[PDB]
Ligand binder design. Structure first.
Ligand code: PMR
Ligand code: PMR
Ligand SMILES: [Cu+2]
Ligand SMILES: [Cu+2]
Lengths: 419, 402, 420, 402
C-alpha cells in the first residue's frame, strides 16, 4: 500500500493505448470509469497529435452498475464500429473495470463484428505500462499476422516503435535510412506506422529488426517461432552499437554492409582537444534498460565518461540490466521508486546525469548537469526538429545533447569567476 | 448519453492543495489515478507536492480490515515525513469505492488517533461519482459538516480563490464597509473559521453545489447573484451582497465606479478581436454558463451552445437570467454527438475539453481550454480583462498564423 | 580612434581565410607579422577542421622589415607552393603589411608560379570581414570561372557558404535535398565544398542559388553580368521563405515545383494549443541582415511573436535592413557597437532575444530568454548534429531552438511558483 | 627562420588583466589585434574586462599628431568612465609600431597631466618585437623603472603567480623563517614593491628575462634556483631562496617535509599513464624546459626534444642542468619543418599550441596545449599532481577512445 508520488510507468491500459494510436485504422474500446479520459490527451499534448486517439471509453458511472455496465460496453463497441469504422478492433479493461466482474472478450464476440477483435487480458495491478504495450502488440500479431510468403527483395520489419515513445519517429527514420543504404527494404513498421493490413504482412519480411525490446520482444519471439523470422538482439544507439547493428543486419540479410558514416561527426568531435575535459567525468544513468545500456556503452567508449551509476525502472529487464552493469563493474539499480534513485544520486554524486524527466528534475534540485535519455519525458522533450537517438546521426544528436549541459555549466562557471 | 470526456474528480486536488498548505490529500486509488495526478500535475510533481496516492494491490483489495490497517500505517509513515500537516484528506477513488473501503470510518479512526492536533476529513472524488471541478466542492462539502458553529452574522466567501483574487474580494467587501469576510477554505486548520445560521454565504464559483447542500444543512441561506466573471457579473455580485447587507446603493456605486471602469476598458480592449464571433461550449468545468454570459454581453460574442456536465439551476439562476435566450443549455455529455455538432456549427472559437483541443485545431477550429480558467485568475474586476484576453488569444493567434 | 572591446566582424583578411578554408586546393599566402596566426585556429576549434587551414604567414619581425619583408613574402609564397602543391594561390595583406609599402602583387608575380595566382586587394582599416570574404570569392571567380558550355540537364550552384559560418554545412545538405526533390542536380558549391576545378565549372550551371548574400552577393552579380547566370533573390529560411524560394527556383529551372512537406512539423506545432502563450511575445533581433530579416519573417508570420527590435551589423546591407524593418513598423538598428544594441535591448525590454552570441550574453545578464541565429558564435553553437537553418527541416530546427529558452524559463518559473 | 605560430604579446594581457586589478590594458592597435583579444578571451569579453583596443582608422594612420590627440581624448574618456583604474598600460602593437607613435612619450605626458592618482606606463606587445609570454615580461619590466629605491633588504618574488599559489608561496616562505616577502606584480600601485642594492629578487617564471635584466640595473640580485613547478623543483627553488637568506638546511627540510609527501603522492597518482612515454615540445610559451625536466625526472617520461621560442640560458641554467643531456634544444620556430620532425618522432604526447593541436590529433598524435599551464594553477607542491593529470589526461582519453 506504499504511497506513490511519481510513477515511472502507467497502468498497462495506457501502454496498450500507445499501440492503438500508433496504428492506423485500429480503434480499441476500453472499459473505464467516467474520468479515465485523461490518458487520451497524452498523445494530443505530449506527442502533439492531431488525430483523436482511437479510444472509445465506456465511461460507466455509479448510476449504472451490474448489467448496465455490460450494456455500456456493448453499446460503446457497437458505436465504435458503426461510426469510427476501424479496420480492426481490440478490447481491454481499465483497473476499475478489471476489479469488477467484467469480461471484455465475451461481449465483443457476442457482437460478432466483421472486423477482427483482439481480446487483451492485462493484470493492471501486477504489471505496468510497458507490459501492456508489449502484450497488446503480441495479441495483435497473434490475431492478425499469418505466415505469408516471403518477399522478393530483402524485407525487414521494424518492431518496437510505439506511440508516446522517446524519439521513436526520428529513430524510425534513421534506421530506415541505414537499411536503405544497406539495400534492405522495410516491409512494415509496427506499431508506429502500422495498419491491420501491415501486421498481416509481418510474415512477409525475411527478418525482424527489434528496435525497442520493451514493446517488441514478445512479438519478436512469437514471430521467431510461428513465422520462422529471426530478430536482431542489438539496438543501434551510438556509433559502436550502430556498427554492430549494421554487421548483424548484413549477416541476417546477406546484404553488403554499406553504412554512410559521412554523416558521422561524434568520433572526431569527441577526439578533439576541446573534449579533453570530458575524460573521466562521472555519469549516472537511469531509465529504460535498453536506453540506459546503450547510453552507458556510448559514454564509456565514445564519450570518455566513467559510468558511475546504472539503473533501470523496467523490473522486466532486471537480468540484462544486471549483466550490463556487471560489465562496467557496478550493480544495477533496478527500482521503480524515485526515492531510491535520489538516495543513490546523493550518496554517489555524479558529475552528469542522463535519465528520465524525474532524473533531470532531481539533478536540477541537486544543481548538477542533466540530460534526458529515457522514455518518461515532457512535451518539450518531444522535438519538432529531427533528433534521432539511433544511427550515425543519432550519435551526433547524443553527443550534442550530452555535452550541452556540461558546456553550459563550464561557461557559466567561467563567467561567474570572471565577474 | 454516451462517452464523456472529462477528468475524474481527483484532478481538483491539483489546485486545491495550493490553497491549503496544511492539507495533504492522500488518494486511495490504483495505478491509474496515481498516473492521472502525476500527469495532470505535470511540473508540480517535481516540487514535493501535498498529494500522494496509496496504490491498492491485489493483497490490498481483499478484505477491508486489512486495508484499513494498511491505510492507517501509510498515514503514520506520511505523518512521520510531514508532521506539519494537520488536516489530511483521504480521497475516495473508483477502485476505492469498488472495494467499499469506509472513508467515513477511517476518518473517525484516524481522528481519534491524532485528536488534539491532526484531524482528518475524508471526501470522494471518484470518477463514477465526481467529475473535474466537482472534485473541489466535494472536498469543501466534507469540511462543512464538521466546522464549528458561530453566533455572529457574517459574510463568508465560499469557494477556492487565488490569494490575489481573495485579497481583492476582501478589499472590495471592506470598501463596502458592512460585513466581515471569513473565506470558507481555510489555508491553515488553526485559521479555521466558524459557520452557522447567523452567517450568510455568497457563492463565488458555479460548481459548488455539494457545499450548497452542506451549508443549507448548516442553516445559512444562500444569496443568489451573478458570479464574478467580467465587470458586469462582479458588479451584480457586489450589488446583491450590498442588498443582502443593506448597504446603500450610492455608497456601493461610489466604491465600484473606478474599478468597474477599469474592468470595462480591460474587457473592451480584448473583446475587439472577438467582436462578432461565435463560441461553442463543451461541458468540462461547469464554468460554462457564466463564461458564456460574460462573452455574450461584455465581449459581444454569440454562443451556439452552452454545455454543462451538471447544471444546478438554483445557483446558476441569476446568471441564466442575464444569459440570453439564444444558446442551447445542455446537461451531461455525449462527446461524439457534441463533436459532430461543433463540426456542423463551425464556431470561430470553441471552449472545449483539453483532450479535444488539439484534434479540433487539426480539424481547423480555434479552441480554448477551460482548465486554464480553472487555475488562472479570471474572477472579479481586475482579472476580468485577463479573462477576456484568455479567449481573445486563440483567435488572435489563428488570425496571425493564417 | 574608438575604444572597442567586442567586434562583430574581424579584419577583412579573415573572410579571405574563410573562403580559403572552405575550398579545397586553394592556398592563402598572408603578409602578416608573427602573432597573426590567431585566426588560423578558429577553424580548427570552432569549425573543427581535421586539417590545418590552407593559409601561410610570412611572420615578419623587427629584423624582417623593408626589403626583408619582400624577401620573406617571396620565400613564403614559393615554399607554400612547393610544399602544399595547391591548384591555386591567393596572396593578401594584413594591417601591418598594409602600413608598409610592400606590394603583394609584384612579389607574387615575380615568382611566376605555374598555378593561377589570385591577387586580393582589400582595404583593411576601412573595411570589414564580410566584404573581405565577398571580394575574395569574387576575385577567385574572376581569375578562375570562364564562360563555359551549359550542362545538358538543369544544374544549379550554391553561392555564399564559407568557412566559419552559421550552420552553413547543414544548410548545404538541406537546400541540396530540396533541389534534388524539385528535380535539379547541384552543379557545384562554392566557397565551401569547392576546388579550383569547381570554380571553373560555375559557368556550366543553368542558374545560381544565392544562399548567403553577405559572402556570395558579388559573385552572383558578376555571374549574371558575364556568365549570364540568373541568381535567386529569396533566402529559404522559414516555411514561407522556403516555399517562395522553391517557387522562384522552379520558375528559374522551368521544372514543376515539388517540395517535400512530410518532414515539416513547425506549422502544426505552432498551431497546437501548447503554442498559445507564444502569441504576442516581443522579440529583439540582431545580427547579419539576411538571417535577421528571415528570422523576423519567421517569427511574425508563423511563430506569432511581435518583432519589437530589428538591427544588423552589416553596413553593406543597411538598405535591405531598413526596407524590411519598415514592413513591421520599426526603424532598423544598423550599428556595429555593442553598447548601442545593449541600450536598445534595455529600452525595449523584449521577452525573447534572437541574435549573435553577444546578444545571448546580454540577454543572460538581463535575465531574458535568448537564442542564437547570427554569425558571431562560439564552439558551442557549431553543432555536431544536423541543425540546418534553411528548408523545412530548418524550420523545425528554428521552432525548437527559439521555443527552447521560453519553455525553459516557463518551467523554471512554474517550479519556483509551486515551491518557493 | 620561416613561418611561426606563436601569438603576439597581446595575449599575455588577458591573464595579466586577471592578476592586476588596478591595471587597465589599453591596446593601441588595429582591428586585427582587437579580434585577437576578443577570440582569445572567449567568455572573458562578455564580463566587461579591463582590456580594450583603440582601433586606428585610416585618418589615424595618416596623422601622427591627430592620433596622439585622439589617444589623449580616449584616455580622458576612459579615466572619466573608470575612476577605479589607478595604473593604465598603453600596449604597443604591430600597426602602432609601424606608425612610430611613441607610446613612451605618450605615457610620460599622460602620467604628467593625470598624476599622481593615475600612473601611466608603456609596454610593447607587438608581435614584431615581443612574442607571447614576453608581453608579461614587457609589462613587468616596464613597471620596475618607477619602483622606489629602498634601503631595507627585501625578498622580491617576480611572476604572475595565481592568487591561491601566491598565498601558498607566501605562507611557505614565512614559515621557512625568511624576512619580508614582496611580489612585483602587485595588485595595487600603493602595494608596488621597492628595489635597491640590498633588495633581492627571485624569478617564479622562466620567460621573465627582461625583468631579470631590468631589476639588475637598480641593484637587485637574482636567485639561482630552478623554477618551482612541481615536487623537487619547488624544493630546489625554496632551498636556494633559503641559502641566500641564510636559513639552515635542517629547519627548511622540517618545514617542507609535509608538503613534499603530498606532492610526491600527487605526482605518482597521475604519472602512471605517462610511464614509458615520449614527449614533444613545440616552442609556444618559453616554459618547455621546466615541464620537460618535471616529466623526464618525476613522471619518468622520455623527451625527444625541448622547443623554446627564445631560451635564456642565464635563468634556465639550473633547470637545463637538471634536465637530461639526451633531449635536444630547439631555437626559433619553423612550424612547417617542425611538423615533419613531429611526424618523424611519432611522440605519444606532443605539447604544442592550440592552433596545431587538432590537425596533429587527426594524424594520430595525442596533443597537449601549452597555453593552459599559464592559466591553470600548476606551480609549487599542491598543484604538482594537477600538472601531472593535465599532461596525462589526453593520453588517457586516447586510450579509452582507441
Ligand atoms: C490530464 C492530464 C494532463 C497532462 C498529461 C498534463 C500535462 C500538461 N498539461 Mg496539465 N496536464 C494535463 C491536463 C491538465 N493539466 C492540468 C493543469 C494544467 C494547466 C493549467 C496547464 C496544463 C498544460 C498541460 C500541457 C501542455 C504543456 C505545457 O504547456 O507545459 C501538458 C502536456 C499547460 C498548457 O499550456 O497546456 C497547453 C498549462 O498551462 N495543465 C490539469 C489539472 C486540473 C489537467 C487535467
Ligand atoms: C588564437 C586564438 C584562440 C582562440 C579563438 C581561443 C579561444 C578558445 N580556445 Mg584558446 N583560443 C585561442 C588561443 C588561446 N586560447 C587561450 C585561452 C584558452 C583557454 C583558457 C581555453 C582555450 C580553449 C579554446 C577554445 C575551445 C572553447 C571550448 O572549450 O569550448 C576556443 C575557441 C579552451 C579549450 O581548449 O577547451 C578545453 C580552453 O579551455 N583557450 C588564449 C588566451 C591567452 C589563447 C591566445
Ligand atoms: Cu539547456
Ligand atoms: Cu539553455
Amino acid at each position: 500500500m506504499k504511497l506513490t508520488l511519481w510513477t515511472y510507468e502507467g497502468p498497462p491500459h495506457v501502454g496498450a493505448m500507445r499501440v492503438a494510436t500508433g496504428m492506423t485504422g485500429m480503434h480499441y474500446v476500453l472499459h473505464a470509469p467516467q474520468g479515465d479520459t485523461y490518458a487520451d490527451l497524452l498523445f494530443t499534448m505530449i506527442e502533439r497529435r492531431g488525430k483523436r486517439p482511437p479510444v472509445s471509453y465506456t465511461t460507466f458511472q455509479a448510476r449504472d452498475l451490474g448489467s448496465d455496465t455490460a450494456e455500456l460496453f456493448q453499446s460503446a463497441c457497437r458505436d465504435a464500429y458503426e461510426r469510427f469504422q476501424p479496420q480492426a478492433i481490440m478490447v481491454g479493461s481499465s483497473c476499475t473495470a478489471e476489479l469488477i466482474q467484467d469480461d471484455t472478450g465475451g461481449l465483443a464476440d457476442a457482437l460478432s463484428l466483421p472486423v477482427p477483435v483482439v481480446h487483451l487480458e492485462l493484470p493492471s495491478y501486477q504489471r505496468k505500462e510497458n507490459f501492456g504495450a508489449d502484450e497488446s502488440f503480441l495479441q495483435i500479431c497473434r490475431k492478425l499476422a499469418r505466415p505469408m510468403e516471403r518477399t522478393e527483395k530483402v524485407s525487414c520489419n521494424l518492431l518496437g516503435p510505439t506511440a508516446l515513445g522517446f524519439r521513436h519517429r526520428d529513430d524510425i527514420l534513421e534506421v530506415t535510412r541505414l537499411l536503405e543504404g544497406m539495400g534492405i527494404a522495410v516491409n512494415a513498421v509496427a506499431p508506429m506506422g502500422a495498419s491491420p493490413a501491415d501486421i498481416a504482412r509481418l510474415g512477409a519480411a525475411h527478418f525482424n529488426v527489434l528496435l525497442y525490446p520493451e514493446t517488441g520482444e514478445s512479438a519478436a519471439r512469437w514471430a521467431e517461432k510461428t513465422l520462422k523470422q529471426p530478430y536482431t538482439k542489438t539496438v543501434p544507439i551510438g556509433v559502436g552499437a550502430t556498427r554492430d547493428f549494421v554487421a548483424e543486419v548484413a549477416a541476417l540479410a546477406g546484404v553488403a554492409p554499406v553504412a554512410d558514416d559521412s554523416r558521422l561527426r561524434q568520433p572526431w568531435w569527441s577526439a578533439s582537444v576541446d573534449s579533453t575535459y570530458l575524460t573521466g567525468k562521472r555519469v549516472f544513468l537511469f531509465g529504460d534498460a535498453t536506453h540506459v545500456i546503450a547510453a552507458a556503452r556510448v559514454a564509456r567508449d565514445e564519450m570518455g565518461f566513467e559510468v558511475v551509476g546504472m539503473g533501470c525502472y523496467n523490473r522486466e529487464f532486471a537480468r540484462p540490466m544486471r549483466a550490463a552493469a556487471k560489465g562496467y563493474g557496478l550493480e544495477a539499480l533496478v527500482t521503480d521508486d524515485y526515492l531510491e534513485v535520489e538516495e543513490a544520486i546523493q550518496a554517489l554524486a555524479p558529475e552528469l546525469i542522463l535519465g528520465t524527466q524525474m532524473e533531470r528534475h532531481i539533478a536540477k534540485r541537486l544543481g548538477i548537469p542533466c540530460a534526458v535519455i529515457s522514455a518518461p519525458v515532457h512535451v518539450q522533450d518531444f522535438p519538432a526538429r529531427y533528433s534521432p537517438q539511433m544511427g550515425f546521426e543519432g550519435a551526433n544528436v547524443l553527443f550534442d545533447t550530452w555535452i550541452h549541459p556540461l558546456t553550459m555549466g563550464l561557461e557559466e562557471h567561467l563567467l561567474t569567476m570572471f565577474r | 448519453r454516451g462517452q464523456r470526456e472529462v477528468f475524474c474528480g481527483l484532478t481538483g486536488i491539483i489546485w486545491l492543495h495550493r490553497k491549503m498548505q496544511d492539507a495533504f490529500f492522500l488518494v486511495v486509488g490504483s495505478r491509474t489515478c496515481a498516473h492521472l495526478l502525476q500527469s495532470a500535475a505535470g511540473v508540480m510533481i517535481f516540487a514535493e507536492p501535498r498529494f500522494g496516492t496509496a496504490v491498492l494491490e491485489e493483497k490490498d483489495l481483499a478484505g477491508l480490515a486489512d486495508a484499513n490497517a494498511e491505510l492507517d500505517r501509510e498515514v503514520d509513515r506520511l505523518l512521520a515525513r510531514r508532521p506539519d500537516i494537520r488536516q489530511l484528506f483521504l480521497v475516495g477513488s473508483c477502485p476505492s469505492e469498488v472495494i467499499k473501503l469506509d472513508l467515513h470510518r477511517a476518518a473517525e479512526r484516524l481522528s481519534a488517533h491524532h485528536g488534539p492536533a491532526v484531524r482528518v476529513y475524508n471526501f470522494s472524488g471518484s470518477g463514477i461519482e465526481t467529475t473535474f471541478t466537482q472534485g473541489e466542492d466535494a472536498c469543501l462539502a466534507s469540511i462543512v459538516p464538521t466546522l464549528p458553529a458561530t453566533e455572529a452574522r457574517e459574510l463568508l466567501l465560499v469557494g477556492a480563490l487565488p490569494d490575489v483574487v481573495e485579497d481583492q474580494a476582501v478589499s472590495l467587501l471592506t470598501q463596502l464597509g458592512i460585513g466581515p469576510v471569513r473565506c470558507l477554505p481555510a489555508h491553515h486548520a488553526a485559521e479555521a473559521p466558524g459557520v452557522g445560521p447567523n452567517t450568510v454565504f455568497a457563492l463565488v464559483q458555479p460548481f459548488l453545489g455539494d457545499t450548497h447542500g452542506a451549508l443549507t444543512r448548516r442553516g445559512a441561506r444562500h444569496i443568489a447573484a451573478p458570479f464574478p466573471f467580467g465587470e458586469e457579473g462582479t458588479t451584480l455580485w457586489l450589488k446583491a451582497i450590498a442588498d443582502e447587507f443593506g448597504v446603500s446603493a450610492e455608497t456601493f456605486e461610489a466604491v465600484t465606479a473606478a474599478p468597474r471602469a477599469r474592468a470595462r476598458k480591460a474587457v473592451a480592449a480584448a473583446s475587439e478581436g472577438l467582436r462578432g464571433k461565435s463560441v461553442f461550449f463543451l461541458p468540462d468545468s461547469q464554468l460554462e454558463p457564466s463564461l458564456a454570459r460574460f462573452l455574450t454581453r461584455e465581449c459581444g460574442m454569440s454562443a451556439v451552445e452552452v454545455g454543462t456536465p451538471f447544471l444546478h439551476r438554483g445557483i446558476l439562476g441569476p446568471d441564466l437570467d442575464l444569459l440570453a435566450e439564444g444558446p442551447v443549455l445542455s446537461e451531461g455529455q455525449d462527446v461524439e454527438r457534441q463533436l459532430d455538432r461543433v463540426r456542423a456549427a463551425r464556431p470561430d472559437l470553441t471552449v472545449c475539453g483539453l483532450g479535444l483541443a488539439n484534434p479540433l485545431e487539426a480539424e481547423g477550429f480555434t479552441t480554448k481550454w477551460a482548465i486554464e480558467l480553472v487555475f488562472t485568475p479570471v474572477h472579479f474586476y481586475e482579472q476580468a480583462g485577463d479573462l477576456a484576453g484568455l479567449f481573445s488569444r486563440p483567435v488572435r493567434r489563428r488570425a496571425i498564423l493564417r
